[PDB]
Design goal:
By secondary structure, this protein is of the alpha+beta class. The protein is 36% helix and 16% strand. The protein has two domains: 103 residues, 2-Layer Sandwich (Phosphorylase Kinase, domain 1); 218 residues, Transferase(Phosphotransferase), domain 1, CATH 1.10.510. A five-stranded antiparallel β-sheet has the order 3-4-5-7-6, with no helix packed on it. Helix 3 runs antiparallel to helix 5 and helix 5 packs across helix 10. The chain is globular and about 70 Å long. Bound molecules: ligand 1RQ. One of its GO terms (biological process) is Fc-epsilon receptor signaling pathway.
């Protein structure tokens, strides 16, 4: 008797529970292959991610393992919640692939970013991102790699964050696909040490992109990225420098210097809906929030709690959403061989 069946979806073979029907490709990345399906048991649409041999290297394995643990711990409407996890393989020795199942969402945030969005929708997306991030922070999870390609939305403007970011302590992979680094905070770009509001920078980069319809800080690498940051925002204050490693400090203290543009210049009125007094006011509040999120120095950048209190955002504020109970192992960050990772991942899948 077989609980599973196989179909080719794109280049990949999906071996899934028979409950999951009519599989359609969504995409394939370096760390997962994704499809839409109908779930005949739940009578609803789902998304399924296949992790192929996630134990194949330390980078794949640490991420897969950590994400599986965290998914089972967190509990919040703006963060991925796992409907099901399974492997078609019957023992540890035969163990190859992991399938993760969640509610089917409608769009990636990249797609949403390209749309002309009203202030109601923009502020509501941002509010939800902040709730998701608050929830993670309350469990001691600091993301540090939030980006629109890992955020999904429904037609009713509801939002979910799909991943849990960088390894707290944290190498290499023979990948064809590059990592998107444009939404990373200065403290990540410059290896600085960080607190909760490292994630505010990324939210600011998303918000600014929603307005500008261009990636705020593009670059081939961190060098290019930092240049794009300083010319727009200017060279940080001496106090910021002191918190840099002597080697990065030399490099930063020595770049072609910049005063940086004001936020009205960075995001002109022509970019904002300003056809009604309501929209003119919202344009002003949006730029104020932006000016507080895109602050190079973390000591001067707004916190998650204060962003949630900002008038652009606070119209949505709800204690049940903002102040939900924290997620519930303590040794997460480790180093292992292929064979050790294989068993760690296998036992988590099997419970
Ligand atoms: O074109 C389609 C479908 C009609 C073919 N779309 C448009 C984009 C959103 C799709 N729905 C969806 N929902 C949830 C996650 C997800 N998803 C997932 C995904 C999917 C399933 C997951 C299950 C467990 C843990 C994480 C999971 C992550 N990865 C994605 C990467 C890129 C991406 O655009 C979406 C990703 N994607 C549906």
């Amino acid at each position: 008797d077989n609980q599973f069946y196989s179909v080719e979806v794109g280049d990949s073979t999906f071996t899934v529970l028979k409950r999951y029907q009519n599989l359609k490709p969504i995409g394939s990345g370096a760390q997962g292959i994704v499809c839409a399906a109908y779930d005949a048991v739940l009578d609803r649409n789902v998304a399924i991610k296949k992790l192929s041999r996630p134990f194949q290297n330390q980078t794949h394995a640490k991420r897969a393992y950590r994400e599986l643990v965290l998914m089972k711990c967190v509990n919040h409407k703006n963060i991925i919640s796992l409907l099901n996890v399974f492997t078609p393989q019957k023992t540890l020795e035969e163990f190859q692939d992991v399938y993760l199942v969640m509610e089917l969402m409608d769009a990636n945030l990249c797609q949403v970013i390209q749309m002309e969005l009203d202030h109601e929708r923009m502020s509501y997306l941002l509010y939800q991102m902040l709730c998701g991030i608050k929830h993670l922070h309350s469990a001691g999870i600091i993301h540090r790699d939030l980006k629109p390609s890992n955020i999904v939305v429904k037609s009713d403007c509801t939002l979910k964050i799909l991943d849990f970011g960088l390894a707290r302590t944290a190498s290499f992979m023979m990948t064809p696909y590059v990592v998107t680094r444009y939404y990373r905070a200065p403290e990540v770009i410059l290896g600085m040490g960080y607190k909760e509001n490292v994630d505010i920078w990324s939210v600011g980069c998303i918000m600014g992109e929603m307005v500008r319809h261009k990636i705020l800080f593009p670059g081939r690498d961190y060098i290019d990225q930092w240049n794009k940051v300083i010319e727009q925002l200017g060279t940080p204050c001496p106090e910021f420098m002191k918190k840099l490693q002597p080697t990065v400090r030399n490099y930063v203290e020595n770049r072609p210097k910049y005063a940086g543009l004001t936020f009205p210049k960075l995001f002109p009125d022509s970019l904002f809906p300003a056809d009604s007094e309501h929209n003119k006011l919202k344009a002003s509040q949006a730029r104020d929030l932006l000016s507080k999120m895109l602050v190079i120095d973390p000591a001067k950048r707004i916190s998650v709690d204060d962003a949630l209190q900002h008038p652009y955002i606070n119209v949505w504020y709800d204690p049940a959403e903002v102040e939900a109970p924290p997620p519930q192992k303590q040794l997460d960050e480790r180093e292992h061989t292929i064979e050790e990772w294989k068993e760690l991942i296998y036992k988590e899948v099997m419970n």
